[PDB]
Amino acid sequence: APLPEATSSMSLAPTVNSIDPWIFLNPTEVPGGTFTVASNTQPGTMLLDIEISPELNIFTAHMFRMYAGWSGGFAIKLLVAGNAFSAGKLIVAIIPPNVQVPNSAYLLTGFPHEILDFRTADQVEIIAPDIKNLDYHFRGDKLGRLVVMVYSPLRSTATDFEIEIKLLSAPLPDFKFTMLVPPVQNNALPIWQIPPTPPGAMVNPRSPLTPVVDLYINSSWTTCNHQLGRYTIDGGAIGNSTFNPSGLWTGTFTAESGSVSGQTNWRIAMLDNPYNPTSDPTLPPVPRGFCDWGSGVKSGARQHLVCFTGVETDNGEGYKDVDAHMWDYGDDATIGLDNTYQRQIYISDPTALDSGKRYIIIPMGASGSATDDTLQISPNCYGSWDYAPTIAPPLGEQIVWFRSYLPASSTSASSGVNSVSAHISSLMSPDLIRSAYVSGFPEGKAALLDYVLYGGSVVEQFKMYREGYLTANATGTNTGFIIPPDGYFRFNSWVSPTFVIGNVVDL
Amino acid sequence: APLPEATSSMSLAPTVNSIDPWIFLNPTEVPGGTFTVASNTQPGTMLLDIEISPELNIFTAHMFRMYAGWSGGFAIKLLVAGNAFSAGKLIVAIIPPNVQVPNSAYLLTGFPHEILDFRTADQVEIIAPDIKNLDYHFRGDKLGRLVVMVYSPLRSTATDFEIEIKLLSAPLPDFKFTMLVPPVQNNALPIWQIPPTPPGAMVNPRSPLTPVVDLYINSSWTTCNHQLGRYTIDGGAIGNSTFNPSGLWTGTFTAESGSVSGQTNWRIAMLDNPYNPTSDPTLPPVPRGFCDWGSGVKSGARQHLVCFTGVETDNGEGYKDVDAHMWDYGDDATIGLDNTYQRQIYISDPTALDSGKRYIIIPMGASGSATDDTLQISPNCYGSWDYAPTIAPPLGEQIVWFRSYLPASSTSASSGVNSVSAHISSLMSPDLIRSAYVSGFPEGKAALLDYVLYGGSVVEQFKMYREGYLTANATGTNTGFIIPPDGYFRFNSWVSPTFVIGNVVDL
């Protein structure tokens, strides 16, 4: 116990409550309180920054949804799962509120601290008190976090094996709830119910009309710059993504009676944005949910084909004469507009284009000599509208990409088209992420979940972060390992973002 | 009151547990315990047959997820909300387990009973004891049901309005739980969290690529015969529907090198169903998720088009010459195939087709004199495979139809297509019913929910059944009523399947 506890009289808190006496005796595991230390962790790194609250125990985190006030501290105990060769030192400190958490062991030592080495080979325990200046906290600024750091690295003498540390907790004899008036449904939960929906029955946000066939992981793609399928728990649909990919796939554009220099057949046109009529820089330029496939930096050689496009029927009741055509962003000449994700596009057609008449487009397919690597990169966007930033996983981890097979739609005609089959991948399907809104993630925590195959004979483990991407550790270098979709995700636990997956990919 | 309860010393249950002391004092509402009485109820009908269990108080329903055993009775109160003109009497009794309950109010006054008038405007109460014979219940048979009936009919014709009856429950001071060991997630939930997504941002199961435009209620469509978009709470996706309509919208078939008698341009063809390789009678004939729009009993003028169709490149690497064409089921001659929703189809094209050659079709649109009325009906289903049954709303109610607008895609050629713009309706979008799987419906109960428009200045009320179709009362006849899709569904309560909604819709 590095710091004394408060009495928590609760004199002026009406209708104080008494909880089950058996909870104080049977300690459970803290939800977000497991982590690991490896041989290559940087000294002075923050492994755990959980805060004192009623969410440090399975029972009081589920019972807390009925009340609106609490006051009391916890008594936690460390399970180390140590070794016989390693040697290092940990550090645990209590941080009072209204205090910028120090990000250096030098400064962290100036706090109620206790230093534990790895050669203790036992299970110590520490008391976490609640620093309150009020009679009892309701649900607000519940600081008093429990930062845990690495004072000295573990240079193991022999095998460089890892250490997994977890925490068990139990309320102090002075922990009480107050004012059970709020019935239900206020805050987070200790569990997450993932329905057993196979990925083979999920929609692909970046390419509808094509079912997901496999899960694809590739070593060369170490970053993502997509603008469709970007979902976050905190922000919902972020960037230009939406929750109905199928509904918003078809688009409409208007001609402008012109052509770019060099090639006259590239009729210029402008896209229509009902959401942002005026070209205000603070809103997305293109209509929401429209394609963002990449085609190259600047090369007329290949050009994704718009496939089905149609002319106005002069009646206002639809369109006419759907034909297979090819399109592209920008002009393939200007460096500042070749790949910018903007309104102006060009469509290749030998015949003249109806000026001032709108057309319907259903983009599906790519033409030229384009490969999956060309399509994987997305045209970068510049401007003022809040767009999805580029994402890179931590070192030693990959990304699961929900790849799907895109057939070819060519023609034998005068102009022709060299469209070829390919594969298109998306960051995360909306079906999986949509479920985790009833019971949101605990703050600054990732979810460790399992993917089982056959009758459970082979189980892989994935870690899902806050922004919605899954890592799967590494086994070696390959052209992209393929996982069948004949399985269901199963929730396993909550882990820190720095957790290292135990099970490896196994080829 | 008329029957004492048992003490239940509970010697054989280890670790008996205590609950909050303020729960016994504040009575909450029993979840599935509201109903209505009118002047047209058939005599001798059970208006309520609820079962004694900890699921009568939202607080003990939330508490019970942590324990494994319960023991104790409740104290129930009735709210009648009558008038000063209604004249009749109700009756509520308690039935011990394993006893044949009669269906007459004359014999029903032998059990411990209570008789309350309709115009009381008070809070009558009855103590419901636990008629247990074992040490303590353990998620097993509890019966002790709480049947409610009508003693003397309300003989009045001047008023003719509905009476709404609700119950409030509170645990007796001897209620207690045992064995807190089970952490969480054991049984159902009493509350439903519906995410605030307007129907305009939902996928239409019967017609993807077209967003929902309005909510449609028509006074002439009194039945549903669809096979797509039909879901149930317990049965998941019933019929030939699926939770990913966009991924299964594209279809394929093979030509048979033939023509129907009379018309030469009608090439006979057969759809391939990978999910049913053999012609097993107990499996659906057509592939899952394929189109099922109706066309007419027998008509060679109202034929809906297949729109995009194409042939493979003779290499299995793509498709070629995808153009707009027309199709239909069967042969328009035989009584067993004219509209029977089976593998064989016929496609209209002047040139004959090469046998054993694969073709791809993406159906969208209807040509000829086909209207929305013809599209609403579906081809009949024959055989022994499990198909979705017919649905008819209870008398005095209509159905909300999730209507979307299907444009026309014509062409100017020698043959051409005369397609017109139409509308397509589906019973239930998958997104709305996806939420109600984590917290399923209670036994034999429907859900009453609110549809809020603008900022809450206008609210409608809908009732959702376990079969997946919404009903919205009625006032009179109309040829198509439109509700804007710019609003979100909000859960209100649980009601009996014969509950009469409050608000009227005025045509």
GROMACS .gro file of N, CA and C in nm, chain A residues 15-23 26 58-59 62-63 65-67 180-185 190-193 200-204 208-211 243-244 246-250 308 313 316-322 324 362 364 405 407-412 420-421 431 434 438, chain B residues 15-23 26 58-59 62-63 65-67 180-185 191 193 195 197 200-203 208-211 242-244 246-247 249-250 307-308 316-324 362 364 405 407-412 419-421 431 434 438:
model
  405
   15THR      N    1  -2.959   0.714   0.098
   15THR     CA    2  -2.987   0.574   0.065
   15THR      C    3  -2.861   0.500   0.020
   16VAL      N    4  -2.766   0.490   0.113
   16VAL     CA    5  -2.647   0.409   0.088
   16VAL      C    6  -2.686   0.262   0.085
   17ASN      N    7  -2.612   0.184   0.006
   17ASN     CA    8  -2.650   0.047  -0.025
   17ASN      C    9  -2.541  -0.050   0.020
   18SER      N   10  -2.584  -0.172   0.052
   18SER     CA   11  -2.496  -0.279   0.096
   18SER      C   12  -2.497  -0.389  -0.008
   19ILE      N   13  -2.379  -0.438  -0.044
   19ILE     CA   14  -2.364  -0.532  -0.153
   19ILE      C   15  -2.335  -0.671  -0.097
   20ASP      N   16  -2.333  -0.770  -0.185
   20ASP     CA   17  -2.318  -0.909  -0.144
   20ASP      C   18  -2.189  -0.928  -0.065
   21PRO      N   19  -2.194  -0.986   0.055
   21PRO     CA   20  -2.072  -1.008   0.133
   21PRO      C   21  -1.976  -1.109   0.073
   22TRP      N   22  -2.021  -1.192  -0.021
   22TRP     CA   23  -1.933  -1.292  -0.081
   22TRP      C   24  -1.842  -1.234  -0.189
   23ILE      N   25  -1.870  -1.113  -0.237
   23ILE     CA   26  -1.784  -1.052  -0.338
   23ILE      C   27  -1.649  -1.015  -0.279
   26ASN      N   28  -1.410  -1.347  -0.276
   26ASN     CA   29  -1.370  -1.418  -0.397
   26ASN      C   30  -1.322  -1.317  -0.500
   58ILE      N   31  -1.531  -0.800  -1.211
   58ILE     CA   32  -1.637  -0.848  -1.299
   58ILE      C   33  -1.774  -0.821  -1.239
   59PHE      N   34  -1.787  -0.836  -1.108
   59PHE     CA   35  -1.917  -0.820  -1.044
   59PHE      C   36  -1.956  -0.675  -1.024
   62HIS      N   37  -2.056  -0.502  -1.353
   62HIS     CA   38  -2.190  -0.534  -1.401
   62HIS      C   39  -2.298  -0.479  -1.310
   63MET      N   40  -2.270  -0.471  -1.180
   63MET     CA   41  -2.366  -0.415  -1.086
   63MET      C   42  -2.372  -0.263  -1.096
   65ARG      N   43  -2.416  -0.072  -1.338
   65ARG     CA   44  -2.512  -0.017  -1.433
   65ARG      C   45  -2.644   0.021  -1.369
   66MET      N   46  -2.667  -0.017  -1.243
   66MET     CA   47  -2.791   0.015  -1.174
   66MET      C   48  -2.782   0.137  -1.084
   67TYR      N   49  -2.662   0.184  -1.051
   67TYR     CA   50  -2.645   0.291  -0.955
   67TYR      C   51  -2.591   0.416  -1.021
  180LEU      N   52  -2.970   0.387  -0.639
  180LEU     CA   53  -2.994   0.289  -0.745
  180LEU      C   54  -3.099   0.335  -0.846
  181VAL      N   55  -3.144   0.460  -0.835
  181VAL     CA   56  -3.255   0.512  -0.914
  181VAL      C   57  -3.238   0.486  -1.064
  182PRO      N   58  -3.123   0.510  -1.126
  182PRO     CA   59  -3.111   0.482  -1.270
  182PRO      C   60  -3.129   0.335  -1.298
  183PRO      N   61  -3.228   0.297  -1.378
  183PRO     CA   62  -3.261   0.155  -1.392
  183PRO      C   63  -3.153   0.070  -1.456
  184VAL      N   64  -3.116   0.099  -1.581
  184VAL     CA   65  -3.017   0.021  -1.655
  184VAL      C   66  -2.946   0.113  -1.755
  185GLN      N   67  -2.855   0.055  -1.833
  185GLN     CA   68  -2.803   0.110  -1.960
  185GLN      C   69  -2.745   0.251  -1.942
  190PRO      N   70  -1.842  -0.569  -1.906
  190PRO     CA   71  -1.722  -0.653  -1.904
  190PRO      C   72  -1.713  -0.754  -2.018
  191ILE      N   73  -1.821  -0.776  -2.093
  191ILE     CA   74  -1.826  -0.880  -2.195
  191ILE      C   75  -1.873  -0.818  -2.326
  192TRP      N   76  -1.866  -0.898  -2.432
  192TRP     CA   77  -1.908  -0.856  -2.566
  192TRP      C   78  -1.964  -0.979  -2.636
  193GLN      N   79  -2.090  -0.972  -2.677
  193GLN     CA   80  -2.156  -1.083  -2.745
  193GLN      C   81  -2.141  -1.066  -2.896
  200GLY      N   82  -1.805  -1.518  -4.458
  200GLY     CA   83  -1.857  -1.547  -4.590
  200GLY      C   84  -1.995  -1.490  -4.615
  201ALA      N   85  -2.065  -1.448  -4.510
  201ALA     CA   86  -2.197  -1.388  -4.521
  201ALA      C   87  -2.196  -1.243  -4.476
  202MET      N   88  -2.090  -1.170  -4.512
  202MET     CA   89  -2.078  -1.029  -4.479
  202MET      C   90  -2.057  -0.949  -4.606
  203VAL      N   91  -2.091  -0.821  -4.600
  203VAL     CA   92  -2.078  -0.732  -4.714
  203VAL      C   93  -1.939  -0.671  -4.716
  204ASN      N   94  -1.884  -0.652  -4.835
  204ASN     CA   95  -1.753  -0.589  -4.850
  204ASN      C   96  -1.774  -0.442  -4.881
  208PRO      N   97  -1.913  -0.402  -5.323
  208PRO     CA   98  -2.035  -0.483  -5.314
  208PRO      C   99  -2.055  -0.568  -5.439
  209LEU      N  100  -2.161  -0.647  -5.441
  209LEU     CA  101  -2.196  -0.742  -5.547
  209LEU      C  102  -2.098  -0.858  -5.556
  210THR      N  103  -1.994  -0.861  -5.473
  210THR     CA  104  -1.895  -0.967  -5.475
  210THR      C  105  -1.876  -1.020  -5.333
  211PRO      N  106  -1.919  -1.143  -5.305
  211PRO     CA  107  -1.907  -1.195  -5.169
  211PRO      C  108  -1.762  -1.214  -5.127
  243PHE      N  109  -2.267   0.326  -4.361
  243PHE     CA  110  -2.316   0.198  -4.311
  243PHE      C  111  -2.404   0.124  -4.410
  244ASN      N  112  -2.426   0.180  -4.529
  244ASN     CA  113  -2.502   0.113  -4.635
  244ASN      C  114  -2.423   0.120  -4.765
  246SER      N  115  -2.417  -0.082  -5.020
  246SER     CA  116  -2.489  -0.123  -5.140
  246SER      C  117  -2.576  -0.011  -5.195
  247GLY      N  118  -2.641   0.065  -5.107
  247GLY     CA  119  -2.735   0.165  -5.152
  247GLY      C  120  -2.673   0.278  -5.231
  248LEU      N  121  -2.549   0.315  -5.198
  248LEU     CA  122  -2.486   0.435  -5.252
  248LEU      C  123  -2.380   0.404  -5.357
  249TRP      N  124  -2.385   0.285  -5.417
  249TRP     CA  125  -2.282   0.245  -5.512
  249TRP      C  126  -2.298   0.314  -5.647
  250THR      N  127  -2.420   0.329  -5.695
  250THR     CA  128  -2.445   0.392  -5.824
  250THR      C  129  -2.437   0.543  -5.812
  308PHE      N  130  -2.093  -0.020  -6.647
  308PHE     CA  131  -2.224   0.017  -6.697
  308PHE      C  132  -2.249   0.166  -6.680
  313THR      N  133  -3.289   0.954  -7.061
  313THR     CA  134  -3.393   0.912  -7.153
  313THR      C  135  -3.485   1.026  -7.196
  316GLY      N  136  -3.712   1.189  -6.768
  316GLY     CA  137  -3.705   1.206  -6.625
  316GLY      C  138  -3.745   1.084  -6.546
  317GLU      N  139  -3.778   0.974  -6.613
  317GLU     CA  140  -3.821   0.851  -6.547
  317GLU      C  141  -3.712   0.745  -6.545
  318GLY      N  142  -3.590   0.779  -6.583
  318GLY     CA  143  -3.484   0.680  -6.580
  318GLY      C  144  -3.372   0.718  -6.676
  319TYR      N  145  -3.299   0.615  -6.719
  319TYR     CA  146  -3.187   0.632  -6.809
  319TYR      C  147  -3.203   0.537  -6.927
  320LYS      N  148  -3.108   0.543  -7.019
  320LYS     CA  149  -3.121   0.472  -7.146
  320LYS      C  150  -2.984   0.427  -7.196
  321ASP      N  151  -2.983   0.311  -7.260
  321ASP     CA  152  -2.867   0.260  -7.334
  321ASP      C  153  -2.745   0.244  -7.244
  322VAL      N  154  -2.755   0.147  -7.154
  322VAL     CA  155  -2.643   0.109  -7.068
  322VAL      C  156  -2.537   0.040  -7.153
  324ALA      N  157  -2.081  -0.051  -7.172
  324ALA     CA  158  -1.956  -0.066  -7.098
  324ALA      C  159  -1.856   0.040  -7.144
  362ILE      N  160  -2.222   0.287  -6.287
  362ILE     CA  161  -2.212   0.179  -6.188
  362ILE      C  162  -2.071   0.122  -6.195
  364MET      N  163  -1.762  -0.093  -6.176
  364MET     CA  164  -1.727  -0.229  -6.137
  364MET      C  165  -1.624  -0.282  -6.237
  405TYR      N  166  -1.298  -1.152  -5.470
  405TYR     CA  167  -1.259  -1.179  -5.608
  405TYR      C  168  -1.348  -1.100  -5.703
  407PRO      N  169  -1.443  -1.042  -6.089
  407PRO     CA  170  -1.430  -1.098  -6.223
  407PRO      C  171  -1.407  -0.989  -6.327
  408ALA      N  172  -1.400  -1.031  -6.453
  408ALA     CA  173  -1.372  -0.940  -6.563
  408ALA      C  174  -1.494  -0.926  -6.654
  409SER      N  175  -1.517  -0.803  -6.701
  409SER     CA  176  -1.628  -0.771  -6.790
  409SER      C  177  -1.572  -0.694  -6.910
  410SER      N  178  -1.531  -0.769  -7.012
  410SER     CA  179  -1.473  -0.711  -7.132
  410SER      C  180  -1.574  -0.716  -7.247
  411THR      N  181  -1.532  -0.675  -7.366
  411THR     CA  182  -1.619  -0.678  -7.482
  411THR      C  183  -1.534  -0.696  -7.607
  412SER      N  184  -1.596  -0.748  -7.712
  412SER     CA  185  -1.532  -0.764  -7.843
  412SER      C  186  -1.596  -0.664  -7.938
  420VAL      N  187  -0.946  -0.698  -6.678
  420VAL     CA  188  -0.899  -0.826  -6.627
  420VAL      C  189  -0.949  -0.847  -6.485
  421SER      N  190  -0.951  -0.973  -6.443
  421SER     CA  191  -0.995  -1.010  -6.309
  421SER      C  192  -0.890  -0.970  -6.206
  431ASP      N  193  -2.054  -0.535  -4.070
  431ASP     CA  194  -2.132  -0.631  -3.992
  431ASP      C  195  -2.062  -0.666  -3.861
  434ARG      N  196  -2.050  -0.340  -3.624
  434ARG     CA  197  -2.179  -0.285  -3.586
  434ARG      C  198  -2.228  -0.338  -3.452
  438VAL      N  199  -2.368  -0.161  -2.837
  438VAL     CA  200  -2.443  -0.181  -2.714
  438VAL      C  201  -2.348  -0.183  -2.595
  522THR      N  202  -2.411  -2.091   0.038
  522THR     CA  203  -2.384  -1.949   0.012
  522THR      C  204  -2.509  -1.877  -0.039
  523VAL      N  205  -2.609  -1.870   0.049
  523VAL     CA  206  -2.723  -1.782   0.023
  523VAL      C  207  -2.677  -1.637   0.024
  524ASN      N  208  -2.740  -1.555  -0.059
  524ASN     CA  209  -2.694  -1.419  -0.082
  524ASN      C  210  -2.806  -1.318  -0.057
  525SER      N  211  -2.765  -1.195  -0.028
  525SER     CA  212  -2.855  -1.087   0.011
  525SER      C  213  -2.863  -0.985  -0.101
  526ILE      N  214  -2.977  -0.917  -0.111
  526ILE     CA  215  -2.998  -0.816  -0.213
  526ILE      C  216  -3.016  -0.681  -0.145
  527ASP      N  217  -3.034  -0.577  -0.227
  527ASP     CA  218  -3.043  -0.441  -0.176
  527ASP      C  219  -3.167  -0.426  -0.088
  528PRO      N  220  -3.163  -0.341   0.016
  528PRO     CA  221  -3.281  -0.321   0.100
  528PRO      C  222  -3.383  -0.224   0.043
  529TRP      N  223  -3.345  -0.136  -0.050
  529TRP     CA  224  -3.439  -0.040  -0.106
  529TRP      C  225  -3.518  -0.094  -0.223
  530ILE      N  226  -3.482  -0.211  -0.275
  530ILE     CA  227  -3.556  -0.269  -0.387
  530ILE      C  228  -3.697  -0.307  -0.344
  533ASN      N  229  -3.941   0.038  -0.362
  533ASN     CA  230  -3.982   0.103  -0.485
  533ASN      C  231  -4.033  -0.001  -0.583
  565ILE      N  232  -3.766  -0.514  -1.313
  565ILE     CA  233  -3.648  -0.483  -1.393
  565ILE      C  234  -3.521  -0.496  -1.310
  566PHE      N  235  -3.528  -0.464  -1.181
  566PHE     CA  236  -3.410  -0.475  -1.096
  566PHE      C  237  -3.370  -0.620  -1.070
  569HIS      N  238  -3.232  -0.783  -1.389
  569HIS     CA  239  -3.092  -0.752  -1.412
  569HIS      C  240  -3.000  -0.819  -1.311
  570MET      N  241  -3.045  -0.833  -1.187
  570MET     CA  242  -2.965  -0.900  -1.085
  570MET      C  243  -2.951  -1.049  -1.111
  572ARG      N  244  -2.887  -1.229  -1.355
  572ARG     CA  245  -2.785  -1.279  -1.447
  572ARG      C  246  -2.658  -1.322  -1.376
  573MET      N  247  -2.642  -1.291  -1.247
  573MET     CA  248  -2.523  -1.326  -1.173
  573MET      C  249  -2.540  -1.448  -1.084
  574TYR      N  250  -2.663  -1.494  -1.061
  574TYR     CA  251  -2.688  -1.602  -0.967
  574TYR      C  252  -2.740  -1.725  -1.041
  687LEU      N  253  -2.368  -1.689  -0.632
  687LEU     CA  254  -2.336  -1.578  -0.722
  687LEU      C  255  -2.228  -1.612  -0.824
  688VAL      N  256  -2.175  -1.733  -0.818
  688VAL     CA  257  -2.056  -1.772  -0.894
  688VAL      C  258  -2.070  -1.744  -1.044
  689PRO      N  259  -2.181  -1.778  -1.110
  689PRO     CA  260  -2.192  -1.750  -1.254
  689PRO      C  261  -2.177  -1.601  -1.282
  690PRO      N  262  -2.076  -1.562  -1.359
  690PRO     CA  263  -2.048  -1.419  -1.376
  690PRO      C  264  -2.156  -1.340  -1.447
  691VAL      N  265  -2.185  -1.375  -1.572
  691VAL     CA  266  -2.277  -1.299  -1.656
  691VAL      C  267  -2.342  -1.391  -1.759
  692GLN      N  268  -2.426  -1.332  -1.845
  692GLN     CA  269  -2.469  -1.389  -1.974
  692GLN      C  270  -2.528  -1.530  -1.957
  698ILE      N  271  -3.464  -0.514  -2.207
  698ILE     CA  272  -3.456  -0.387  -2.277
  698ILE      C  273  -3.388  -0.408  -2.412
  700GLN      N  274  -3.191  -0.193  -2.730
  700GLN     CA  275  -3.128  -0.070  -2.777
  700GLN      C  276  -3.130  -0.067  -2.929
  702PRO      N  277  -3.038   0.121  -3.258
  702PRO     CA  278  -2.951   0.231  -3.300
  702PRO      C  279  -3.028   0.332  -3.383
  704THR      N  280  -3.055   0.485  -3.672
  704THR     CA  281  -3.027   0.493  -3.815
  704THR      C  282  -3.157   0.507  -3.891
  707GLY      N  283  -3.395   0.560  -4.442
  707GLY     CA  284  -3.334   0.603  -4.566
  707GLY      C  285  -3.191   0.557  -4.583
  708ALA      N  286  -3.127   0.513  -4.474
  708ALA     CA  287  -2.992   0.458  -4.477
  708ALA      C  288  -2.993   0.309  -4.449
  709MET      N  289  -3.091   0.238  -4.503
  709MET     CA  290  -3.102   0.094  -4.487
  709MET      C  291  -3.114   0.026  -4.623
  710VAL      N  292  -3.066  -0.097  -4.629
  710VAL     CA  293  -3.070  -0.175  -4.753
  710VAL      C  294  -3.209  -0.234  -4.771
  715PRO      N  295  -3.168  -0.427  -5.396
  715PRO     CA  296  -3.051  -0.344  -5.363
  715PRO      C  297  -3.019  -0.246  -5.474
  716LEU      N  298  -2.915  -0.165  -5.454
  716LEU     CA  299  -2.870  -0.059  -5.544
  716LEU      C  300  -2.967   0.058  -5.549
  717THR      N  301  -3.081   0.050  -5.481
  717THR     CA  302  -3.178   0.159  -5.479
  717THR      C  303  -3.215   0.191  -5.335
  718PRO      N  304  -3.186   0.311  -5.286
  718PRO     CA  305  -3.216   0.344  -5.147
  718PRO      C  306  -3.366   0.354  -5.122
  749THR      N  307  -3.155  -1.377  -4.713
  749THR     CA  308  -3.024  -1.384  -4.650
  749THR      C  309  -2.993  -1.249  -4.586
  750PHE      N  310  -2.894  -1.249  -4.498
  750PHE     CA  311  -2.853  -1.126  -4.431
  750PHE      C  312  -2.758  -1.042  -4.514
  751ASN      N  313  -2.717  -1.089  -4.631
  751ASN     CA  314  -2.630  -1.015  -4.722
  751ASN      C  315  -2.692  -1.017  -4.861
  753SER      N  316  -2.683  -0.802  -5.101
  753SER     CA  317  -2.600  -0.748  -5.208
  753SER      C  318  -2.504  -0.853  -5.263
  754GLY      N  319  -2.457  -0.944  -5.178
  754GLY     CA  320  -2.360  -1.042  -5.222
  754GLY      C  321  -2.419  -1.155  -5.304
  756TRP      N  322  -2.702  -1.104  -5.514
  756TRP     CA  323  -2.795  -1.049  -5.612
  756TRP      C  324  -2.763  -1.094  -5.754
  757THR      N  325  -2.636  -1.116  -5.785
  757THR     CA  326  -2.595  -1.162  -5.917
  757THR      C  327  -2.619  -1.312  -5.929
  814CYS      N  328  -3.214  -0.716  -6.763
  814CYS     CA  329  -3.116  -0.608  -6.773
  814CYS      C  330  -2.982  -0.672  -6.807
  815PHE      N  331  -2.880  -0.662  -6.722
  815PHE     CA  332  -2.745  -0.699  -6.762
  815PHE      C  333  -2.731  -0.850  -6.771
  823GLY      N  334  -1.289  -1.895  -6.873
  823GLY     CA  335  -1.314  -1.891  -6.730
  823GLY      C  336  -1.247  -1.777  -6.658
  824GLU      N  337  -1.210  -1.671  -6.729
  824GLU     CA  338  -1.135  -1.560  -6.671
  824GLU      C  339  -1.214  -1.429  -6.670
  825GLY      N  340  -1.342  -1.432  -6.702
  825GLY     CA  341  -1.422  -1.310  -6.702
  825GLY      C  342  -1.551  -1.331  -6.779
  826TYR      N  343  -1.609  -1.219  -6.823
  826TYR     CA  344  -1.732  -1.222  -6.901
  826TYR      C  345  -1.725  -1.118  -7.012
  827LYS      N  346  -1.809  -1.137  -7.114
  827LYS     CA  347  -1.808  -1.052  -7.232
  827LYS      C  348  -1.951  -1.016  -7.272
  828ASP      N  349  -1.962  -0.909  -7.351
  828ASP     CA  350  -2.086  -0.862  -7.412
  828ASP      C  351  -2.203  -0.864  -7.314
  829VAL      N  352  -2.190  -0.784  -7.209
  829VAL     CA  353  -2.296  -0.769  -7.110
  829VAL      C  354  -2.389  -0.657  -7.155
  830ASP      N  355  -2.513  -0.694  -7.187
  830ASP     CA  356  -2.610  -0.601  -7.243
  830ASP      C  357  -2.745  -0.626  -7.178
  831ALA      N  358  -2.842  -0.540  -7.210
  831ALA     CA  359  -2.975  -0.547  -7.152
  831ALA      C  360  -3.063  -0.644  -7.230
  869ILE      N  361  -2.790  -1.012  -6.402
  869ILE     CA  362  -2.811  -0.923  -6.288
  869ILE      C  363  -2.948  -0.858  -6.302
  871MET      N  364  -3.265  -0.641  -6.298
  871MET     CA  365  -3.310  -0.512  -6.245
  871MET      C  366  -3.399  -0.446  -6.351
  912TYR      N  367  -3.789   0.307  -5.501
  912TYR     CA  368  -3.822   0.348  -5.638
  912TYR      C  369  -3.722   0.289  -5.735
  914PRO      N  370  -3.593   0.284  -6.110
  914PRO     CA  371  -3.599   0.361  -6.234
  914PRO      C  372  -3.607   0.269  -6.356
  915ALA      N  373  -3.618   0.331  -6.473
  915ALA     CA  374  -3.628   0.259  -6.599
  915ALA      C  375  -3.501   0.275  -6.680
  916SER      N  376  -3.453   0.164  -6.737
  916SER     CA  377  -3.332   0.163  -6.820
  916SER      C  378  -3.369   0.101  -6.954
  917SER      N  379  -3.398   0.186  -7.052
  917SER     CA  380  -3.442   0.143  -7.183
  917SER      C  381  -3.327   0.153  -7.284
  918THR      N  382  -3.355   0.123  -7.410
  918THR     CA  383  -3.257   0.137  -7.517
  918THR      C  384  -3.331   0.157  -7.648
  919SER      N  385  -3.261   0.216  -7.745
  919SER     CA  386  -3.318   0.244  -7.877
  919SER      C  387  -3.252   0.151  -7.977
  926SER      N  388  -3.924  -0.071  -7.086
  926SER     CA  389  -3.935  -0.069  -6.940
  926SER      C  390  -3.984   0.066  -6.890
  927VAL      N  391  -4.055   0.062  -6.777
  927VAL     CA  392  -4.109   0.181  -6.713
  927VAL      C  393  -4.062   0.185  -6.568
  928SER      N  394  -4.064   0.305  -6.511
  928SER     CA  395  -4.029   0.322  -6.371
  928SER      C  396  -4.137   0.263  -6.281
  938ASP      N  397  -3.124  -0.450  -4.135
  938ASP     CA  398  -3.055  -0.372  -4.033
  938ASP      C  399  -3.140  -0.354  -3.908
  941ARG      N  400  -3.155  -0.685  -3.718
  941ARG     CA  401  -3.027  -0.736  -3.672
  941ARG      C  402  -3.003  -0.706  -3.525
  945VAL      N  403  -2.931  -0.990  -2.986
  945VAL     CA  404  -2.861  -0.994  -2.859
  945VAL      C  405  -2.959  -1.002  -2.743
   0.00000   0.00000   0.00000
